[PDB]
UniProtKB/Swiss-Prot annotation, chains A, B, C:
One of its GO terms (molecular function) is ATP hydrolysis activity. Coiled coil: none annotated. Molecular chaperone; binds unfolded polypeptides in vitro, and has a weak ATPase activity. This is Thermosome subunit alpha. It comes from the Archaea. Keywords: ATP-binding, Chaperone, Nucleotide-binding. NCBIfam families: thermosome_alpha, thermosome_arch, thermosome_beta. It holds the Pfam family Cpn60_TCP1. Gene3D superfamilies: GroEL (3.50.7.10), GroEL-like equatorial domain (1.10.560.10), TCP-1-like chaperonin intermediate domain (3.30.260.10). It comes from Thermococcus sp. (strain JCM 11816 / KS-1). Belongs to the TCP-1 chaperonin family. SUPFAM superfamilies: GroEL apical domain-like (SSF52029), GroEL equatorial domain-like (SSF48592), GroEL-intermediate domain like (SSF54849).
Amino acid sequence: VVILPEGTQRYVGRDAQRLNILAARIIAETVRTTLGPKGMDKMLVDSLGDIVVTNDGATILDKIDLQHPAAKMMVEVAKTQDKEAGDGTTTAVVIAGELLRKAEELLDQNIHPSIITKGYALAAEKAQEILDEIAIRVDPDDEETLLKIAATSITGKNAESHKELLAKLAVEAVKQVAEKKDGKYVVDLDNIKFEKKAGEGVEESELVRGVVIDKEVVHPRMPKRVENAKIALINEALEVKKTETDAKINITSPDQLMSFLEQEEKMLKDMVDHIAQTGANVVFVQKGIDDLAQHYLAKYGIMAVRRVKKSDMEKLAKATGAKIVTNVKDLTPEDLGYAEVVEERKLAGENMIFVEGCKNPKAVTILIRGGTEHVIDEVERALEDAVKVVKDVMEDGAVLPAGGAPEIELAIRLDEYAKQVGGKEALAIENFADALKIIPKTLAENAGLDTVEMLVKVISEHKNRGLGIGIDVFEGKPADMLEKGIIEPLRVKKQAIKSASEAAIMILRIDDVIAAKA
Amino acid sequence: VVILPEGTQRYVGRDAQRLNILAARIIAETVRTTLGPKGMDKMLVDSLGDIVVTNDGATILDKIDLQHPAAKMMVEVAKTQDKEAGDGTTTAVVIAGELLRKAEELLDQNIHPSIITKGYALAAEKAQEILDEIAIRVDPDDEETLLKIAATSITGKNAESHKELLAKLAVEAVKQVAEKKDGKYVVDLDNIKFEKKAGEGVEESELVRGVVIDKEVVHPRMPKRVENAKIALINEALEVKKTETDAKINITSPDQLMSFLEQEEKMLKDMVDHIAQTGANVVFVQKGIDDLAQHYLAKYGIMAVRRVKKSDMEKLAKATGAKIVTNVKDLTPEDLGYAEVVEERKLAGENMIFVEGCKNPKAVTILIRGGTEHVIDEVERALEDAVKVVKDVMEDGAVLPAGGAPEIELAIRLDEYAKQVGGKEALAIENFADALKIIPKTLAENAGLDTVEMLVKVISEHKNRGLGIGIDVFEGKPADMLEKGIIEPLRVKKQAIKSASEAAIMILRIDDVIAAKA
Amino acid sequence: VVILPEGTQRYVGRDAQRLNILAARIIAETVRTTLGPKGMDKMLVDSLGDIVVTNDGATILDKIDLQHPAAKMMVEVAKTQDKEAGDGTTTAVVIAGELLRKAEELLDQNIHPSIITKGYALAAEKAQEILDEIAIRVDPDDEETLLKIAATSITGKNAESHKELLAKLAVEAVKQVAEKKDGKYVVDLDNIKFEKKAGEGVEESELVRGVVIDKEVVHPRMPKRVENAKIALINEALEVKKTETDAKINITSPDQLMSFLEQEEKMLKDMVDHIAQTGANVVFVQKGIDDLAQHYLAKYGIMAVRRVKKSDMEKLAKATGAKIVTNVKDLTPEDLGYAEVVEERKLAGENMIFVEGCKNPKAVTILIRGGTEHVIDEVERALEDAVKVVKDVMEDGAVLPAGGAPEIELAIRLDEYAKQVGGKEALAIENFADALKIIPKTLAENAGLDTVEMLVKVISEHKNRGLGIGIDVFEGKPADMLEKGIIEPLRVKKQAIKSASEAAIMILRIDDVIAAKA
């Protein structure tokens, strides 16, 4: 009997399983080649011909147009990993793939899915306990650590050539923006601007203790540089105000034509006059500025920029100290901000306003320079992770070695744990532990090393020497990640195992796939 | 003669019956593999490409694009179960499938349909008396019982890995929200919000004795945290009011251009002033909030949120005690609510507002966290069922054992009831009793146990040890369900038989199908 | 640069392997469900609506229209197995598939395929030795064991309902036509004919110590039954002969039109007359028989058949003892054969000739009766196997237990062998040993038993009691196969392993698939 529409496709039991797992395995196999300091990049071109060159796992999975649903779910793993911890996106997708691969060996041995699923949930929970335990508690503020986290992050990415600098710029920015409260920090990444402009070299990028607005000084007669600038922030358009209630002038005598043109003229002037009287010499207006207004600002020697982005008004406020005022009328000197220098400056041709030298900015800007548009785009991404990863540490105060060290310890510990629980769940558990080895395994692989030999060396060397033993892909030998300074946030590995696990266990429970026709 | 339009399909008698019962049987066979704590899930992809991975029967049947009308009939059963009792969607459809299957054996024996129908109705009514009679009455808020109900509900779903936590949250939320009238409890599930947000793990989900609104503080200079918050709830927009009747300002002198602007200016300000005067320091406005208003509101150090959903306004009142006022002017201190803490906060990046720590909230929020969108989506569903099962018991005050125990009880007795009425109705009644065993049969079937033997052992032991005996899928052995806490609501089983029966009878009365071309 | 033609497909490395192996495994999982006493059958309908219902692995794979190259390669395994041992066609394919599954696990470890390949060959050669050792030697003609071989061969098929009768016929037939040159037996399965005729049940099937031919007695006045028949076997047609060299009669007088006519008559009469003179009373002619000749044979009371099939002439000779002569002229008494009864009978309404009661028939016929044509076709296949496995044991005094006992013995021993080889080959040898368990595994699987549990009991017991311990699917537990009388030829296992092994190694060696557009 015709129950489902002609065109609907369906797979049940093992077919549903074989398919779903394979799609996931293939996606993981697609991004794993990107993982690690010797991992390479992918060039992606969408339907419109837009080109994206990047090493980022999340970006890749996001830009690429996947079909198979199982493959789409893996994307969720990378996306969530990215929002919560920054780095580790390729790691989570890769681990998720391997977990499934190891589960199908069991699935094939006829272990009921519920058992595998239960075993994994146990291993996953136990992996978090171990991580919280073997993590290196650190000084949320320690610059030396924040720098290694940043530098380690900016590795195996196009921008690695200038990681010392970029790391430095990334740590400084987060430190400044970071808000202290209860010996515990909180970082709002919106207080860090990323302004990019091709030209020069990446080595020319910098941190501006203030804001870099891609705007211009409205009037040519205004000053292009103001030293000890008193900044005023208004978001009310400098123009002739009209009531909300409909209203219309009723001219009855010829003299009114003038009296009303002048009244509007006076209103416009009084606004500018009011501004001047606060002693402000620089004004940023979120909205428009009539020509007459601009003219008086110019005659006052007041520099002015109009139609400034809402988010840009906020950064200026936090950097300069200035307080945004809705109406010019309410502007007082106590609302002006400070900046050592504010000036129009041309970058790769285009003019831009620089508000720098702010006392203690609560918002900062990283100016990214580079040889081509594509270059500065992939630097901005590298920098985005660096910032988030630095953030993770200042907020968590916990760090771990990299090089596969965590995944290796976990694989040793979780396996021993398996023996403790026994039964068929112990099979799922030891399989979970096994799957974790793709991280160290993939690192050596991408480095063109003999996968089998390396694992043998690190595991044993790690078992002997300790928690920090991981793979130094550059030197192609086991090494102490801690001494090498190869370090990452605890959160990266925590979120990575959480998302991958939950995703795997969800996919692993699907024994019936029913897709309609598109 | 050409009576019907070309393309019209028609089936009569055995044909009409054979196809109708087949589609239903198949729809039942499709969701049965989802039944029980060992049941699996289905991934459903629609014509747009949106993915739905779940275990819930109603969701499945609802999301799938069914063609055959008899199949569409079954969708009604699962749906009604879901609204009325929450859990039990799949079993209702399964029983309905089985009932029709056993009925056809009688049709084939040439028993007139009206007799089979009569037997089923007799059997179904008798089943309700039996269910009401063996039902285990317990007291409405017995936390221990409620926790077993929620835990039993959560098992067999993706979330089961964390059922202890989720059960606890479900129960707490319902106990708090529940209202008692005349020694009777009534629960409006609208006083329980579910907020989702990927990141962390399902293990991080919590119960907020207050409200989590997905919005942010409208003004940057407003506080982001208010401790002993005095909350004001207003829905009228904080903007310049206009009459319902049309009006237009008729300007006649220049001095007016200013006088009217300042009047609107004053109106805006007066509102904010009035709010401040009540003592309020946190205000949720349902409509919009003018820049000028936000500016004054800010200067007062009052946190404010614009465009808050009406449903969220209602639960903020229920929770904080605040009273929703329409016009700012009518706001009073007695209209203000309380919250131990109200603060903006970022979750996986996106900002949010927490109104936590209310005295005796009447509405609460279960904040769900998870590794991926799909995971929190399924968790939400599980939480939904859990909550409704807990509601069933607080309102009904009756519970039954699970594991196919009730069905085995029903099967025994109903079969004995048959012997009583005798005749041909007796055949229909004894078949209804037989049909009821798919539940225990399917539990064993999805667990990989020998259906025939398990069925023999339960019915046997059940007859010796009574009501409590059902199947323990996790131990592949019969067991006292009451002892193991494997318990479920009386409503779940009652509503199941009701909908399963009426549907089966309706289909069974059909001896002519007439379908027009689409 | 365009090297290959558009439409050409190519896969390389892991892709070529993934594809090839997945293909092989799928084709193996497909025929897998027919293995063992509780293996089921498949109905194959080709493009011409022709229907085939078997349990035979070789028949299935040969009839299915396979697209994938890898799949096509498994067919050769099934086919070569059938030609050499009869049974084990499915086993060979199932093992080959598992062998590849276990090998990709090593491929994923990045174990060079050269190593996996070398290891598998060691395991295979070792397996042959082990088989030759554990092989139980018996008397090639020992009826007792011969019947056990046949009876186990037949079980698990449609004709098992009558495995006693059928085995008796098979063992009897092969024994009779079997030739013992020098203390060594050799058997030509061509001396055993299979005749099918729908009608009655499979129980009426029988062994004719002679030949059954689907022909009729050429002339009506000829005897339909001849008691102690003196059979004559003529090859040339009984017609007016003609020279090889072109020739024509040149008539010159009326008297010749008649003399040449009477001469051709005389020629026909002499032939028949001559035959008659030998004393022959039954005559099978391979070619035609002129109407005049028929008339004479009739007068002489000689029963004759014309147009007898060549292969039947040879069976008639081998059975009756008659010597086949080319020209009637050379036929003599010493050439006549003997049959205790040559008679015409109707079967399913069709006339057939029965030559039975032969002295020491060297060619024999098994007459197959059945309920339908399909039933009869499947019994014929069931018999073709019984006949061949019996043949195996008469030429090889070797026999082995079944129920997966051999594969279990091999898995245990080959695992030990691995240890003394060590290194990565050890891994490969272990996987080859592991792979061998799908036999016992799927035997239990098809019986509905628990694979994991069974495997543990069998191996445990086998280790305790010895070589004969295997799975008794009918009783659902381990048992002694030798006592139970469940034995198979040594050949079945030896060939299976070879074919499976050589094919697996061949596929593992591929790393580049290049397919032209069809």
